[PDB]
Structures are given as C-alpha cells and as structure tokens.
Symmetry: C2
Subunit: 51 residues, 2 copies
C-alpha cells in the first residue's frame, strides 16, 4: 500500500522441498483466522487450497 506501507497480505504459500512433496498433499482444506484492518480478529473461512 503506497500510503504508510504496511504490506497487507494477498495470500500465502508453503514451500515444497524434497521431503514434504508427499506431506503437503494430504491437506485439502485450510482454515484461517486473521486480524483485519477496520475490525479485529475475525474467523475467516475454510475454503480449499489454490495450488
């Protein structure tokens, strides 16, 4: 954000290395709870991963 840049999040990854290429596959859904900007710490969805 150009004004008072605080790098508001757009998304995420989870790095693949040689080993976890089997372990990152069993996780199908992702529940996230975050702290937004104008309100506090809300519970935000469980939608599927994006890959």
């Amino acid at each position: 954000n150009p004004s008072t840049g605080n790098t508001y999040i757009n998304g995420m990854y989870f790095a693949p290395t040689q080993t976890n290429k089997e372990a990152l596959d069993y996780i199908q859904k992702y529940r996230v709870e975050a702290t937004l900007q104008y309100s506090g710490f809300k519970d935000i969805g469980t939608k599927d991963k994006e890959m």
Copy 2:
C-alpha cells in the same frame, strides 16, 4: 521490495503543525543511526536537512 515485502526506508518527513513552525526551522542538521541492510547498526553521517 519485490521478492519479499520488507519496505526498506528511503527518507523521513516531519509534519508541520501550527504550533511547531518555530522549532523545526531551528534545527539544521540531523544525525542518523539505523539498522542497515547487510551491515549492522552502523552510524551514518550528520548531513543537513533538505526541506
């Protein structure tokens, strides 16, 4: 920064309020010391303001 949101600093304004137009125009130089990128907490100069 493009590869990782880290927001390296470039400069530093000081906001002029109605009640402090005398104090800021009184200060000529500014001595700075911060955490650098690859070096440590070095000291860097005392150069004049730039207005």
